[PDB]
């Protein structure tokens, strides 16, 4: 059905949308942004330690 309609199911881009001075559900949204940044820095720290070397061997 998705290929015949050619339409894709929408993903949640709410984490990009979040804004300051908002309600309790959006307080959950900004803390979600903090956990995503700590994970993103951890994921970037592994790539830096590996170096290109890992892109070289593949």
């Amino acid at each position: 059905a998705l290929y015949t309609e050619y339409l894709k199911q929408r993903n949640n881009k709410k984490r990009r949308t979040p804004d300051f001075n908002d309600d309790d559900d959006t307080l959950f949204l900004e803390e979600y942004r903090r956990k995503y940044p700590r994970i993103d820095t951890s994921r970037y720290i592994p790539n830096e330690s590996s170096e290109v070397s890992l892109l070289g061997i593949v």
Partner: peptide
């Protein structure tokens, strides 16, 4: 209390994304 968590995130979004 909600204004302090987004400001800690704005400190994180300053620090981590510039490091990113």
């Amino acid at each position: 209390s909600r204004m302090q968590h987004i400001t800690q995130g704005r400190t994180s979004m300053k620090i981590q994304f510039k490091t990113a």
